[model samples]
Every structure is written in structure tokens, then in C-alpha cells.
Target: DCCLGYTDRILHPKFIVGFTRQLANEGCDINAIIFHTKKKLSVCANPKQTWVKYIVRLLSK
Candidate 1:
């Protein structure tokens, strides 16, 4: 529904376990990807990032 903020820091694919969901901006403040890693850590990332899209297309849930 919303994001606290977005990460501009692109993550390496090796760090991703998988994605939980993908979000669209529309009129919202952010367009982000939700993913968790082996660390069991989740973060919201800017979908505009090429790497973000790459991972989303590959490891999406």
C-alpha cells in the first residue's frame, strides 16, 4: 500500500533469496520491489533500477 522510503542502492542478485511482491507507482510516491534475502531481510527498492527489474523478472513471487 505504501513504502517508508526506497533504496537507491542496487543489490547484487546473489543477495536475493526471492521477491515477495512487485509494486507499481501509478499516483503513489514510489514504485518499488519487495524482496527478502538469505539473511531474511526485506527491503523496498526503486523499480526504476535496471537491476531491480532484472531480479523481479527472474525471482518474482
Candidate 2:
């Protein structure tokens, strides 16, 4: 059954950052972002584009 075939996968940090950057570029007003994993959920935010870019760069590494 489709419902019984559920699977979980972890997201790469760089991929997540890329998605956030895309959203920001589309003018989505990305004041906050929520991330979830099998074990936990995380909430992060940045008001300035400079700070977001810095964080994204760190994640890219």
C-alpha cells in the first residue's frame, strides 16, 4: 500500500541553503525557515540578506 511504503531521507545542508537562497531571490520574505529531520525540528531566521548569505556560505562548505 502507498501508505505502508513510507520512507525517510535526510536533507543535505548545502541543498537546504540552496533552496533558501532561491526563495529569497524570488522575494519570498524569508524571515524564518523551519527544517525537520527524523529526530528533531529546527527553526532559524535572519533579518539581513548579508547574514543569510554568510550562513549559506558556511553551509556550502
Candidate 3:
């Protein structure tokens, strides 16, 4: 129930991670969404990327 947009708020790991799970539950491909979002955010070098990776690992469990 979140809006898809380019907002600073959405860049937070908590929101993005939760949103990632939500999208997966809706039958969207989890990896696809993760990859897509990561690419869009250029998350690799971003400090918040650590949070992103951590959340993803937690969810995978």
C-alpha cells in the first residue's frame, strides 16, 4: 500500500526492505524486484546498502 515514486523517504532501508517483502508476497519476483531496485538506487556503494543486504538476508531465512 505504498506509492511508487522517487522520494527520499522511500530510500530508507526499513521502508525499502518492507516494501520488498510486500511486493514478493503479492506474487512479484523477489529477486527481480531486489535487483531492479538496487540498480535504480545504485545501492552497491551506498552506505545504506549494508542495511539493505542485512534485511534481505534476514528475510531469506
Candidate 4:
């Protein structure tokens, strides 16, 4: 399911293994970015997070 909301927390890039997709244009109430962990765990975070764009655009290589 799409993310409903967030409590304004920042997740370090170290815990993030990969990115899945975003749902801001789909079913989410607010803009969201979903990051996956090494164990296939999902973390819904704000798209504007500094570390978020850094990985989604720079770390996927």
C-alpha cells in the first residue's frame, strides 16, 4: 500500500539498500519515497529528504 503519512524523521543512507518507487502521483496522501533494506523491508520517507535524492539519483549505479 502507499504511504499514508510520516512523523518527520530522517533515515540514514547506510540503512537503505535500494529504492523501490514513489506514490505521490498515485494513491498516497502526500509525496512519498519508498526505500528498501537489505532484508526487503520498506521505509516510507519524505521525498525532499537530503539523503533520499542523493541515493535515488546518485547511488543506483
Q: lDDT of model 1 at residue 4?
A: 57
TM of each candidate vs. truth: 0.64, 0.30, 0.27, 0.69
Q: List the residue pairs that clash in candidate 3.
A: none
Worst 10 residues of 4 by lDDT: 5-14
Error of 2 at 13 (Å): 11
User: Residue 24 in model 1: shift from native, Å?
Assistant: 6.1
Better-scoring candidate (TM-score), 2 or 3: 2
Better of 1 and 3 by lDDT: 1
Whole-model lDDT, model 4: 0.73
Tens-digit per-residue lDDT, 1-61, candidate 1: 5665777666878888887554554655655677789988888887677778888887755
Model 4 ranges off by over 4 Å = 7-10
Residue 15, candidate 3: alpha-carbon lDDT: 36
Ranking by TM-score: 4, 1, 2, 3
Candidate achieving higher TM-score, 1 or 2? 1
Q: Which residue runs does candidate 2 get wrong by more than 4 Å? A: 1-39
Candidate 3 structure, TM-score to reference: 0.27
lDDT of 3 by residue, 1-61 (tens): 3223222334344434333322434643332223224334422212244555565666567
Mark the regions of model 3 whose C-alpha exceeds 4 Å error after superposition.
1-7, 10-48
Q: Write the per-residue lDDT of candidate 2 for residues 1-61, one digit (tens) a residue.
A: 0121111343345444332322444544444333323445443434244554565566567
